[PDB]
Structure formats: C-alpha cells, structure tokens
Design a protein around this ligand. Structure first.
Ligand SMILES: [Mg+2]
Ligand SMILES: [Mg+2]
Length: 136
RNA sequence: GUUCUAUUUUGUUGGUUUUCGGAACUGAGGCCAUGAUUAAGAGGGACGGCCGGGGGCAUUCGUAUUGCGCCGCUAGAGGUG
C-alpha cells in the first residue's frame, strides 16, 4: 500500500481508461500493461438517481476519488485512453469525458499521452432498431 | 454432223435416195469495250492496345459482435424523458 520503492526525480506511470458512455462514466486506472487494476470509480456510484450517472458532475467526482486513491499507491502520472461505446453503436464520447479528464489535471496528477481507443469496426453486425429506426 | 420429218422434183399408175422446208440433239469455232454499282456519320464480323464496385468459381485478410477459459480490483451495471 506504500507504493514503489524509488528515489524522486522521475514519475511513475499508470494508465486510466475512461469510458464516457451516455449512461455513466468509468474512470479506471491500471498499470502500463493494463492487467492490474489499481482504482476503478464509476460515475454512477457518486449519485443518488440513475438519471445523473452520466452527468459531468459525477465524472468530476469520480476522477477526484480516483486521483486521491492513486496518490496513495504512489502513481504520479497517467496516460489517457479515451473511449466511447463505439463498436456497432455511437462513436462520440459522452458528456463526462471533458469533466473527468479535467479533474485529473487539477488533482495533482500529471497527464502523459492522450489517445482514442474507441472500437471502430471494419463492419459490424446489424444495428439495434428497426429499418425505420428508433422513432419517437 | 445424227435423228424424226412437211411436200415443190422425176409425162400418166408403183420402189429407193438427195436437195428442199419444219422439229430435236450434238462437235469445233468468231465475237461482245464480253459479263460483279458503290462501300451508308446502316449493320454483322475479324484485328490492336486498353478500360470497368460487369458475371461465375476458388483463395486471402480486417476490426467489430456474441460466447468460453484464466488473471486484477472492486459494488454496482444496464437501459430511459
Ligand atoms: Mg419493435
Ligand atoms: Mg418527430
């Protein structure tokens, strides 16, 4: 729980995988390989109503909790892998992406590289909904 | 040339054969200014270099989706106005 044994003067790097969907936000810090989870706080566990799971306020609250727990383990800098739902469905990142990443930059973390890892398909299976679409 | 063959021919009655005309076939010739309109801003075809998500058969690659196995940390995740 103390963290890495290393002298100062260098950063130790983790990676946060941000999943900014339209229904909630996942802030999920892991090591370089991605195999070891270090802290996963979701935007939906910081609100009392499930209408606000995707709120930018929840994303800000989630990132602050992740950053504070990240400081405990000793990680100082993060690489960003922004991600929308992607795949067959919509590919634009949700409202929580902007606020979740801004919080990590204001909570003492150091931002490394930013990349987009949304899963675009070469072509996927037929999409949910009728031929007439989701009409309302 | 061959065949069939009308009738003028032999003084007046009978027999053959020509010529003579009519019909047919056939051999060797002369000659034509000897004999085929052009090649459609019609078409068919051949030929030459290309061109194309045209067609059929086989092969090869891609991420995504779903499902399963293992590993990590966690209490929520999904959807909706
Ligand atoms: Mg229906
Ligand atoms: Mg309407």
């Amino acid at each position: 729980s103390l963290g890495p044994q290393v002298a100062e003067g260098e950063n130790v790097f983790g990676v946060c995988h941000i999943f900014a969907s339209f229904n909630d936000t996942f802030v999920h810090v892991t090591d370089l390989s991605g195999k070891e989870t270090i802290c996963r706080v979701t935007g939906g566990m910081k609100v009392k109503a499930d209408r606000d799971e995707s709120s930018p306020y929840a994303a800000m609250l989630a990132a602050q909790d992740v950053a504070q727990r990240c400081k405990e383990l000793g990680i100082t800098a993060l690489h960003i892998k922004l991600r929308a739902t992607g795949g067959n469905r919509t590919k634009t990142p949700g409202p929580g992406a902007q606020s979740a990443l801004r919080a990590l930059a204001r909570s003492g973390m150091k931002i490394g590289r930013i990349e987009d890892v949304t899963p675009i398909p070469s072509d996927s299976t037929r999409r949910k909904g009728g031929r007439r679409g989701r009409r309302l």
